[PDB]
Design a protein around this ligand. Sequence first.
Ligand SMILES: NC(=O)COCCOCC(N)=O
Ligand SMILES: [Cl-]
Ligand SMILES: [Cl-]
Ligand SMILES: [Cl-]
Ligand SMILES: [Cl-]
Ligand SMILES: [Mn+2]
Ligand SMILES: [Mn+2]
Ligand SMILES: [Mn+2]
Ligand SMILES: [Mn+2]
Ligand SMILES: [Mn+2]
Ligand SMILES: [Mn+2]
Ligand SMILES: [Mn+2]
Ligand SMILES: [Mn+2]
Ligand SMILES: [Mn+2]
Ligand SMILES: [Mn+2]
Ligand SMILES: [Mn+2]
Ligand SMILES: [Mn+2]
Ligand SMILES: [Mn+2]
Ligand SMILES: [Mn+2]
Lengths: 98, 101, 107, 107, 98, 99, 81, 88
Amino acid sequence: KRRKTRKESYAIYVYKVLKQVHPDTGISSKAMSIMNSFVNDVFERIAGEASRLAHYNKRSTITSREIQTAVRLLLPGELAKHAVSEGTKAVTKYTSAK
Amino acid sequence: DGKKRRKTRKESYAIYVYKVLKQVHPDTGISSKAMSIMNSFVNDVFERIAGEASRLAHYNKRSTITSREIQTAVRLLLPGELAKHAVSEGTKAVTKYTSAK
Amino acid sequence: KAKTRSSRAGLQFPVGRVHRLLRKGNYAERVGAGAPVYLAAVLEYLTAEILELAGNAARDNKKTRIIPRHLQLAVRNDEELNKLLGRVTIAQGGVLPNIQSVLLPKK
Amino acid sequence: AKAKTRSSRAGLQFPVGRVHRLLRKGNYAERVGAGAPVYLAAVLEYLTAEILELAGNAARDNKKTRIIPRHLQLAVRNDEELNKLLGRVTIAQGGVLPNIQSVLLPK
Amino acid sequence: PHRYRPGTVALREIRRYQKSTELLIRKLPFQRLVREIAQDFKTDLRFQSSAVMALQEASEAYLVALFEDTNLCAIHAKRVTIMPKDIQLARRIRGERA
Amino acid sequence: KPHRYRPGTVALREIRRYQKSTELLIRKLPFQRLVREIAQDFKTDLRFQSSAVMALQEASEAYLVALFEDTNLCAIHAKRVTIMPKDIQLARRIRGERA
Amino acid sequence: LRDNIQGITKPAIRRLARRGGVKRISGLIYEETRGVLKVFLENVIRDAVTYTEHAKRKTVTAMDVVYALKRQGRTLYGFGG
Amino acid sequence: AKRHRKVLRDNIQGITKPAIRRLARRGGVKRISGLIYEETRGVLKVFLENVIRDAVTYTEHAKRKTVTAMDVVYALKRQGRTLYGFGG
DNA sequence: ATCAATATCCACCTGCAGATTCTACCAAAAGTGTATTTGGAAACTGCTCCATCAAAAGGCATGTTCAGCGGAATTCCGCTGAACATGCCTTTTGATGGAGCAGTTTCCAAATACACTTTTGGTAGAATCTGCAGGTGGATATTGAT
DNA sequence: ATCAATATCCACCTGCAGATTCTACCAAAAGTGTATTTGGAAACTGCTCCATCAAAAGGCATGTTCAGCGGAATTCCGCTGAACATGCCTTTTGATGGAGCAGTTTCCAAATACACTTTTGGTAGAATCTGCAGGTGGATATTGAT
Ligand SMILES: NC(=O)COCCOCC(N)=O
Ligand SMILES: [Cl-]
Ligand SMILES: [Cl-]
Ligand SMILES: [Cl-]
Ligand SMILES: [Cl-]
Ligand SMILES: [Mn+2]
Ligand SMILES: [Mn+2]
Ligand SMILES: [Mn+2]
Ligand SMILES: [Mn+2]
Ligand SMILES: [Mn+2]
Ligand SMILES: [Mn+2]
Ligand SMILES: [Mn+2]
Ligand SMILES: [Mn+2]
Ligand SMILES: [Mn+2]
Ligand SMILES: [Mn+2]
Ligand SMILES: [Mn+2]
Ligand SMILES: [Mn+2]
Ligand SMILES: [Mn+2]
Ligand SMILES: [Mn+2]
């Protein structure tokens, strides 16, 4: 009769992406844990690099621009190209809307 | 006057490094290039210890970096004998500081 | 009434959550509005890239469920992902079949 | 009415006040305890003392009165723990430790 | 009177284990080893089962990758047999000995 | 009747000489052009602080010297005293720069 | 008897080598391997224990290990992060 | 626009055989194969391309046109090759 | 080349651990409007230092000759690991108390941002000082031919 | 094992760049005191899931035989080190235009903390459903002896 504090994870969001890429494909529990680790890992690396970028340039704010440069610093060629395009597209749609 | 321009001052650990140098080797000097290396060393270790302390606090869901986080960070970062001595100097400094106000 | 930032950006990944994680993670004093959106998009895209390749590996093995093994095959067989995860161990992933030619039976 | 530096109170040469401030601007955490910067300044001061002790000795060994990068490198690389602490660090103008593999020697 | 020549079964084993993902060291012995080593750092410790497994996954992945490097060193010296000096060279270049 | 040191003697002398000093071993101007040429291919119209070029040279030489130490070890491992491309290739592969 | 480190048997070490693509193994490899594994475990466990003590626990958790592996440059996926 | 900045080309050859010999000597090398020089040039080119790419990325992010010693130092740190002696 | 012993494959089958589906619960979180605050772009511009042409010159790269001896191909044999069958003892598996990892609530020692007040670490300037780089040469090794 | 061609050691000597010395001034910073706020140590403790024990499971320790790998011994081609002549281009000492990095101040687009309110996202006890690991059968490829 306690509670068991909520332990967040990207599991549900990863699953949605899975269905968009392979509608008829499942994923085991262990595999999903691996994907959660992956998402957390990339988040930390990108955010950390963006953090250093802001600091190096004596800025108190982490903007889409730091995330972008961070992406170019961290991801390999083609991967960086697409990540940047996806990032820019998402911000546009977000800005260009309400 | 005129349109002077206060070149923003750049801080360094130089004067403090100098003081420690004389304590250990009273008659030994240090070139500017070596001092730049020493300044890089202190900043590097500062960043590493602070970074380890930061993650450590986060891992334990704490929002405060205390001497206890610094101590654990020092043990994780420093090899054997250096850690042991760093911990003593650190502990001693804190215990002394807290008996002074 | 209110609309999730994710929906506005047209993403599956939680922009609101990413935003929250950015500050609590102590990355900077302030966080621009577009930062969490851009970041969520990058995370979603990378997620899609690996699941895409992992799904294919599963299909190639005549399976419908992606397991660790499939994530490893997808990553290690992809030059860029392999590089990105060059210092990561995927539990229960095994390794790629590979035998140095000089070890093979005599022609 | 007697304002003593936190360093003096702590019996240190390194700047506690500066260290406290750097910890804040570095955004390492939301909050910083009072003993944190004292402990950290002590450790930085101790490590400096350790490397300067060894570098000064290297300088004396080479009949020099002024410590140069070469002396800092000689001190770090000849010391097991400092060498490990700085295993991925390059000291400019430090050169390397004299070391010729046995098999390369004559006769 | 069947008998496979030296190397045939070895080759067969390489293909088998490179196809599977299961742990190769037995659990119990590994767990005792882990507990014994930890005892030197802190007495009366307990381990979550997942902690030991994580330790075993990382240890085997490390040893498997080291064996690959070790094999490259043996082959470099024109041998097909790995020796201690091969493991030593590999670790030195990786900077684990260095 | 002329004097001549045996092959390897001067080489050993050079090792001792260079392991004792710390000066950069690559000509400065040529290195600077290399840096400017490479940078230019990435982005045109770039300028360089003189210390940026020196930092690149100190880092580049330290990287190469340490790589030659590893390479020498691979050659010695194969019972040779002469370093060859494959020694460099093995060293970089084990270091994880290549594979 | 047979003390712990020896528990890591010859057949086990051979299986690891096989997965690593090794065809022939010298008799001296087995002891060399155990020594190497011991060093690996000591390094990782020492750090995992340090995280455990810092959290004031008596139980080493998977996360303690994951964090230890990560600072050692050996990130592991599948156990929390 | 200002004038002529002579086309930069083939500067990798500026890394001469004697220079490579010297580096190998500091590295404890006693004998060197004739093919080492080109192999070494290729390795240095990769090393420099990687560091310079990151350093320039820092430059552009800061909206500068001048690569600073700090841009290089930060780039080296990123790649696990921390350099002491040039700030930071 | 010809059997003969084994391993390897593939199509098929089905038990079941683990993934999917349903239901009720609810605290943790995220969206937006309002008020208050400010980081950092914008515009003007001081001034550091980067690109560069200038010129003399010797440190050092280039290109060649010559042959010492290292790399590598070959032969070969002692021996050390691979393959294999035998019998057993260690690991695996499932059941079970209870040690602590946590969920919950309490409440004070301690972490600030702001206003003051002040000591000091930085720095621009020129002005005397000094450790040692580098040239010289004479005394002591190190080499290599005989 | 004596000898000569050379490199190496080295304490003495000194021009000079780098280091040290100060007068000067000063804006950026840090220290004690409220006054306000709260993170997280602390005490209590429910509920996992960890250590442990016994029975069922099945991998491994062990000695023999010998295939074939590793490395010693020998051979010699030709590559690479040493030495040398020639002269080029890097290095050094200087100076200048001015690109562009950076100091200073005006100011608004944008960011932040509640307070109020909504619907998710995560947890959990219950029943139901399935992808696929092994298990079997028969065919056939692989390996190895002759
Ligand atoms: N919602 C806000 O912006 C209020 O922040 C100010 C509270 O901090 C204490 C103080 N003296 O500033
Ligand atoms: Cl503290
Ligand atoms: Cl933004
Ligand atoms: Cl060996
Ligand atoms: Cl080669
Ligand atoms: Mn070009
Ligand atoms: Mn401002
Ligand atoms: Mn020429
Ligand atoms: Mn030979
Ligand atoms: Mn044997
Ligand atoms: Mn209890
Ligand atoms: Mn002063
Ligand atoms: Mn000298
Ligand atoms: Mn609280
Ligand atoms: Mn052989
Ligand atoms: Mn301009
Ligand atoms: Mn829901
Ligand atoms: Mn099957
Ligand atoms: Mn059958």
